Design a protein around this ligand. Structure first.
Ligand SMILES: *[C@@H]1O[C@H](CO)[C@@H](O)[C@H](O)[C@H]1NC(C)=O
Ligand SMILES: *[C@@H]1O[C@H](CO)[C@@H](O)[C@H](O)[C@H]1NC(C)=O
Length: 43
């Protein structure tokens, strides 16, 4: 199986704001907060 997520972090080391990590990392998880819309707000 592929391996680009954690990989992007592995090379990081311990950063909290660089480029690939902050991007790939965040996206790797995410919390329904992408440019689109909430779950079910304002019926
Ligand atoms: C991101 O983390 C810090 C940025 O200050 C640095 O050590 C590192 O080189 C940057 N880039 C990557 C790929 O980690
Ligand atoms: C809004 O959606 C809910 C379902 O979660 C529904 O019960 C309700 O009738 C809809 N309209 C209003 C005014 O809440």
């Amino acid at each position: 199986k592929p391996a680009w997520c954690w990989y992007t972090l592995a090379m990081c080391g311990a950063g909290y704001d660089s480029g690939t990590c902050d991007y790939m990392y965040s996206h790797c998880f995410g919390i329904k907060h992408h440019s689109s819309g909430s779950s079910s707000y304002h019926c």
